[PDB]
Amino acid sequence: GTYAVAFRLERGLVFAADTKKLQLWRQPGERVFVLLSAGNLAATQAVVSLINEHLSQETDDEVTTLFTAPNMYRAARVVGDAVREARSINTNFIFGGQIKGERPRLFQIYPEGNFIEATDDTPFFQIGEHKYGKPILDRVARSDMRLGEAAKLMLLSFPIDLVIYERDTFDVTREKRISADDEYFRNLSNAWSDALRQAFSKIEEFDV
Amino acid sequence: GTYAVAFRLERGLVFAADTKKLQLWRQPGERVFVLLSAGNLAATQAVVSLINEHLSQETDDEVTTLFTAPNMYRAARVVGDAVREARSINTNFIFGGQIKGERPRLFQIYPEGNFIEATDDTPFFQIGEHKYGKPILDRVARSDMRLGEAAKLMLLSFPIDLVIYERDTFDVTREKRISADDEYFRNLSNAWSDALRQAFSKIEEFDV
Ligand code: NA
Ligand code: NA
């Protein structure tokens, strides 16, 4: 039982998962992909192993892999196929990234390998037994947020593996592990609590 | 699958449940009790029926009922016995109230009829498949809150049945059903969203 969350913004993608429940693939300057899992270790490994089997050993050209997918919809279908086929060996996955010639895209993959895509209206997904802090994300998340502010919002909804992907870079450089002893994260959390109490103090003006 | 929440404050008790998942017993001027359930209808009815069976038909004086319990710990044990025995016919219950000569008290009852009591440090309980908005309650709930402000905080964590119990009154007069079309509740919720966005705008000053 773990939790993960991802945001699609105008400026790129942000991924976060606690504890690997965050998996990366990359061809420098051409494509990057991140998979987040909330299933047990066997489920995660089975899906990743199927993806990697086709990347490493596929002999049939017309069988699409993450590195031959012409766009992110097709890449999502690859992961969908792996998620469904891994049942042969009860959590959703999050999958996003970018392929050259197309904007960054983000998907939520269901157990049967069907999926939905993030939009400007619904710019984030949460997976896991508890979708921690969903109300705050619903109310505060906006698609025009800076990547760092999205990351901060995501972190407050929760060590945590955090990846910030900047649009059109086709690399994952901003990768970060944040522990419970991280003093920056504690300072942010304490300020958030103070701000919440102040926010509630304002709105208790209103009757119900 | 439903959600319920209760708060113990200096000034009394507040109970809320959505959809009866909120059950009331009373002897005017002597004792009041509220049970909240998050189980299915059969589980709730079984526990309530056992409580009522002993209130209505018990022939043995030494068998404690809600109306013979000398204090709220003993009353909690009565409910615990009903919760455990109802298994003979996977959710916690919340049970609180007041008996004359003692402060108001609030308990969370587990499947085996064991329980824990609310304290000034931990002044609330949540039950149900999803403990909606737990982070906000953890950060904002205080035991010295007015009953109405506690109610507002509880409502934001979510029709909803709301009971406010004022200390030493031994009656439940402030009983309220709040629908999705309630304009007061919509106004409160909209203000909360605005306040959250402002709270996040402040604290994004901090790095992580
Ligand atoms: Na905006
Ligand atoms: Na205080």
Side-chain angles (χ1 to χ4, degrees):
Chain A
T2 52
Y3 166 70
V5 56
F7 269 56
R8 185 192 84 163
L9 308 178
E10 295 174 327
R11 290 185 158 190
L13 303 172
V14 188
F15 303 89
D18 58 24
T19 56
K20 269 179 159 179
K21 297 293 173 75
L22 187 156
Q23 297 287 339
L24 175 60
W25 297 261
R26 167 165 176 274
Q27 289 190 310
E30 300 297 337
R31 50 186 71 220
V32 293
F33 308 103
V34 180
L35 180 67
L36 306 181
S37 182
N40 76 319
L41 301 174
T44 305
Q45 288 165 35
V47 171
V48 174
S49 70
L50 289 162
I51 289 164
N52 291 343
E53 187 194 30
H54 295 94
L55 292 173
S56 307
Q57 298 179 276
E58 183 50 70
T59 59
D60 186 356
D61 286 346
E62 76 201 347
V63 176
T64 312
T65 76
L66 289 190
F67 295 169
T68 65
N71 63 61
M72 273 297 304
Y73 173 87
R74 296 290 302 285
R77 286 172 63 91
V78 166
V79 177
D81 297 345
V83 169
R84 190 193 320 108
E85 291 163 23
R87 302 181 72 75
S88 308
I89 297 160
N90 289 24
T91 61
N92 297 335
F93 292 75
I94 292 163
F95 178 73
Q98 197 186 5
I99 294 158
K100 183 143 279 179
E102 184 182 53
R103 70 152 301 169
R105 296 170 72 178
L106 185 68
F107 302 85
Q108 188 169 256
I109 315 300
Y110 297 93
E112 285 294 306
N114 59 306
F115 55 77
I116 55 164
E117 186 175 357
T119 62
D120 299 322
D121 291 345
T122 309
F124 69 92
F125 295 122
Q126 291 174 289
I127 57 172
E129 190 174 309
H130 308 288
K131 297 177 187 181
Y132 290 117
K134 177 170 272 193
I136 279 47
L137 302 186
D138 287 339
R139 294 167 183 273
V140 179
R142 294 293 186 276
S143 57
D144 70 340
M145 285 185 314
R146 291 176 230 90
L147 297 169
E149 88 184 282
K152 290 167 196 179
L153 181 58
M154 290 161 65
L155 285 172
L156 292 165
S157 80
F158 285 82
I160 303 159
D161 287 349
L162 171 71
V163 164
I164 293 169
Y165 175 68
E166 297 177 8
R167 183 168 190 149
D168 305 334
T169 63
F170 302 100
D171 192 6
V172 175
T173 65
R174 293 167 73 177
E175 202 283 319
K176 199 170 191 169
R177 187 159 288 178
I178 301 159
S179 62
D181 65 61
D182 187 72
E183 296 299 328
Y184 287 86
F185 181 52
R186 294 286 293 177
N187 176 62
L188 184 66
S189 183
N190 291 338
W192 181 232
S193 293
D194 292 353
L196 284 169
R197 292 188 234 107
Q198 292 177 73
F200 186 70
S201 285
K202 295 276 195 189
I203 67 103
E204 72 195 353
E205 280 178 351
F206 298 110
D207 207 339
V208 73
Chain B
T2 52
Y3 166 70
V5 56
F7 269 56
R8 185 192 84 163
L9 308 178
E10 295 174 327
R11 290 185 158 190
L13 303 172
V14 188
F15 303 89
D18 58 24
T19 56
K20 269 179 159 179
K21 297 293 173 75
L22 187 156
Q23 297 287 339
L24 175 60
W25 297 261
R26 167 165 176 274
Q27 289 190 310
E30 300 297 337
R31 50 186 71 220
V32 293
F33 308 103
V34 180
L35 180 67
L36 306 181
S37 182
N40 76 319
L41 301 174
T44 305
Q45 288 165 35
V47 171
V48 174
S49 70
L50 289 162
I51 289 164
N52 291 343
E53 187 194 30
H54 295 94
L55 292 173
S56 307
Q57 298 179 276
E58 183 50 70
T59 59
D60 186 356
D61 286 346
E62 76 201 347
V63 176
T64 312
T65 76
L66 289 190
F67 295 169
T68 65
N71 63 61
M72 273 297 304
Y73 173 87
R74 296 290 302 285
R77 286 172 63 91
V78 166
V79 177
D81 297 345
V83 169
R84 190 193 320 108
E85 291 163 23
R87 302 181 72 75
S88 308
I89 297 160
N90 289 24
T91 61
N92 297 335
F93 292 75
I94 292 163
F95 178 73
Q98 197 186 5
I99 294 158
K100 183 143 279 179
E102 184 182 53
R103 70 152 301 169
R105 296 170 72 178
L106 185 68
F107 302 85
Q108 188 169 256
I109 315 300
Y110 297 93
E112 285 294 306
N114 59 306
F115 55 77
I116 55 164
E117 186 175 357
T119 62
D120 299 322
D121 291 345
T122 309
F124 69 92
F125 295 122
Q126 291 174 289
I127 57 172
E129 190 174 309
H130 308 288
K131 297 177 187 181
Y132 290 117
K134 177 170 272 193
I136 279 47
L137 302 186
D138 287 339
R139 294 167 183 273
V140 179
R142 294 293 186 276
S143 57
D144 70 340
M145 285 185 314
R146 291 176 230 90
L147 297 169
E149 88 184 282
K152 290 167 196 179
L153 181 58
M154 290 161 65
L155 285 172
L156 292 165
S157 80
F158 285 82
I160 303 159
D161 287 349
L162 171 71
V163 164
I164 293 169
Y165 175 68
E166 297 177 8
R167 183 168 190 149
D168 305 334
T169 63
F170 302 100
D171 192 6
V172 175
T173 65
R174 293 167 73 177
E175 202 283 319
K176 199 170 191 169
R177 187 159 288 178
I178 301 159
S179 62
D181 65 61
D182 187 72
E183 296 299 328
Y184 287 86
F185 181 52
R186 294 286 293 177
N187 176 62
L188 184 66
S189 183
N190 291 338
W192 181 232
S193 293
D194 292 353
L196 284 169
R197 292 188 234 107
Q198 292 177 73
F200 186 70
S201 285
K202 295 276 195 189
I203 67 103
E204 72 195 353
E205 280 178 351
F206 298 110
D207 207 339
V208 73

